[PDB]
Subunit: 144 residues, 2 copies
């Protein structure tokens, strides 16, 4: 919570599109007590859209990677499980962060669907992945 | 128009899925206003449809509700790129689970085209639309046979 508010201020000048997604998670946490099941579902949506936003930025930071049909199977290979040699350093960190958010959102979805008891602990594990991935993205963009 | 015929039939077989199909229709009629926003809406709606199909799978297979640890690993294998459909599910459960993977794989593919600057979003959206329509038909039919 306190770490996300700090990251949203940094992203407001570094990557305001991602900063608005951090503010979305802060809103979901702020209204968590009203409905924790809706907060978990909202967190799954935001982390998926955050992972999609990260992949989009990787292709933007590597414009020459955009034959479009060739890129299709390449984005799918970069969202699961090597990295192309021409991919910029910032593109590597942001692509890895997108994978971590996707796996965390999928695991959180599986815990919610199966009726896992400790849903709050399951959401805290996904929040910890979202915080750590946003930190690595903010650091790579600063050195870029 | 195919979705309109499906939305009518879904309002009896499964109203929740018909609601999501109606959201896809609205994203198509308003596609002229903002194609980029229409594609991003179709991606999230197809993913929501896949989350709805998986919930119905567990509802139709209540034996999995007894062990949340094994079922959580089962759903996580469905959401992943592996997409290993278990063979012990019910007939409707297997069909809906495969349709959930097909919707998610088509949603990721449409995202890949959008992030790649395909510029031909109508062709890309029509391809993901074809997977969505065929998956919805298999789900509506499977639930119709299950209710008899």
């Amino acid at each position: 919570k306190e770490e996300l508010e700090k990251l949203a201020k940094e992203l407001s000048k570094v990557w305001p599109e991602l900063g608005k997604l951090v503010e979305e998670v802060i809103k979901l946490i702020e209204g968590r007590s009203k409905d924790p099941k809706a907060a978990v579902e909202g967190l799954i949506e935001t982390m998926r859209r955050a992972a999609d936003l990260l992949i989009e930025k990787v292709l933007e930071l590597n414009p020459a990677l955009k034959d479009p049909a060739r890129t299709a199977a390449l984005v799918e290979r970069l969202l699961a499980g090597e990295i192309p040699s021409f991919l910029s350093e910032a593109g590597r960190v942001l692509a890895e962060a997108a994978v971590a958010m996707r796996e965390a959102a999928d695991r959180l979805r599986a815990e919610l669907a199966a009726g896992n008891e400790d849903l709050s602990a399951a959401a805290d594990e996904a929040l910890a992945v979202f915080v750590e991935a946003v930190r690595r993205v903010a650091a790579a963009l600063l050195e870029h």
